Amino acid sequence: NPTKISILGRESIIADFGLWRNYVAKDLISDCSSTTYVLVTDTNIGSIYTPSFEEAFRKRAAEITPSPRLLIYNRPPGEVSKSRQTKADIEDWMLSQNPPCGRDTVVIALGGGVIGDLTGFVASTYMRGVRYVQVPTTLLAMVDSSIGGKTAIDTPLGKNLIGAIWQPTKIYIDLEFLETLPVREFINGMAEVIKTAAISSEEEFTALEENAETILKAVRREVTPGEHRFEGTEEILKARILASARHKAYVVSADGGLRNLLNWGHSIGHAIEAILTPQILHGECVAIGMVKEAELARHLGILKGVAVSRIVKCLAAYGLPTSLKDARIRKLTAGKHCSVDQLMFNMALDPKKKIVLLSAIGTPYETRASVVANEDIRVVLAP
């Protein structure tokens, strides 16, 4: 049975296994009644899941009268698609439709944090805003990128510079997408997952700690014909993940302050990110950022050394990097390292920086980011 989570006090998230093949299509033409449905995704994810829906759709589609339409759009993969250019193409394609897609349109963003942010924004402006729904296919996008309504596109001058806040009418979470998801991508998203637990529930973090081996194996497992990747670990998985989504959903319904706690490990993660990108992923930087930011709390006497080692353990126990000198990261970027001045500078692109400090695993020092001295920061970065 699907689990329903609420955002901004309203039905929104519906999670379970395989909602894609048998749920979305019907649930759409039911709740999101419309005559036109524009699906957007990238060739990568598309080619793997597009066919299934065209079937699921036509199915539930023709069942009703008149039958609505499904127009599909495939954009190139990569961060390069979140651009003023494609957005317009998308729009233009839509207006070009016969008949042109109208305000009654219901857009479906099927993808990771990229297709999400892009399609969300597209909807947010098409004829001053039209309905849309999230169908994250990335772990991260499932527990973050798709919850909150934050949408945007990049500019050669920066990322997420142009966009808007546009809440999706529905956020379908089909855990099966994680079957085909690249292992590195899974492990990437896990960072957020952990982040979540670390600032909300001690019990949750602990469970994570236990399930690691279990979950990790599955992802790395060899799927025998006829099978489904997570057969047997469904609840352990579904639980741990929704745990995060649930939290993000909660904090979004509240915040400005509380919502700042979602930036744990990010304060430093982003400074690292700026340098190690794009060879290194987000969650990868955030993972290290978390460790570093964790070490910082202890340094200020807030966090117990015990917990610092516990966070490091959990991260690495899931395949996440824990130091800037991580051997795997090295071979991935020959000729690149993060000076302390570069880090501290990158952080300034946001005398005293604001940071989420943990009092203990599950309990943040405050209900928001605290102000730390540039000097104290400089010591956790110091070799």
For residue 232, the partner it binds in its own copies, ligand NAD, Cl ion, none, with Cβ less than 5 to 8 A by kind, is Cl ion
Cβ at position 121, least distance to ligand NAD in Å: 10
If binding is defined by CB under 8 A, does position 163 make contact with its own copies? yes
Interruption sites in the chain after residues (C→N beyond 2.5 Å): 255, 350
Residues 50 and 280: their CA atoms lie apart, in Å, by 29
If binding is defined by CB under 8 A, does position 352 make contact with its own copies? no
Tell me the window of 64-72, 178-186, 188-196, 306-314 that interacts with Cl ion (CB under 5 A): 64-72
Residues 165-194 that bind Cl ion (CB under 5 A): 167, 169
| 70 three-class SS | strand
If binding is defined by CB under 5 A, does position 138 make contact with Cl ion? no
For residue 127, the partner it binds in ligand NAD, its own copies, Cl ion, none, with Cβ less than 5 to 8 A by kind, is its own copies
Tell me the window of 85-93, 135-143, 294-302, 365-373 that interacts with ligand NAD (CB under 6 A): 135-143
Cβ at position 368, least distance to ligand NAD in Å: 18
Q: Which DSSP symbol is given to 231?
A: T
Cis before 321? omega within 30? no
Q: Is 270 a catalytic residue?
A: yes
Q: Which residues contact 322 (CB under 8 A, 6 or more apart)?
A: 287, 288, 291, 312, 315, 316
For residue 332, the partner it binds in its own copies, Cl ion, ligand NAD, none, with Cβ less than 5 to 8 A by kind, is none
Spell out a b/e string for 136-175, using b for 16 or more CB atoms within 10 Å of the CB, else e: bbbbbbbbbbbbbbbbbbbeeeeeeebbeebbbbbbbbbb
What does DSSP say about strands 106-111 and 69-75: parallel, antiparallel, or unpaired?
Answer: unpaired
Nearest by Cα to 303 from 354, 366, 247? 366
If binding is defined by CB under 8 A, does position 65 make contact with its own copies? no
If binding is defined by CB under 6 A, does position 362 make contact with ligand NAD? no
For residue 119, the partner it binds in ligand NAD, Cl ion, its own copies, none, with Cβ less than 5 to 8 A by kind, is none
Residues 25 and 22: their CA atoms lie apart, in Å, by 7
Tell me the one-letter amino acid at 105: T
Nearest by Cα to 88 from 168, 153, 157, 158? 153
Binding site for ligand NAD (CB under 6 A): 42, 44-45, 48, 77, 79, 82, 111-114, 117, 137-138, 140-141, 144-145, 148, 150, 159-160, 177, 180-182, 185, 188, 282
Q: Would you name the residues annotated as active-site residues?
A: 270
Binding site for its own copies (CB under 8 A): 84, 88, 91-92, 95-96, 100, 124-129, 150-152, 155, 157-158, 160-165
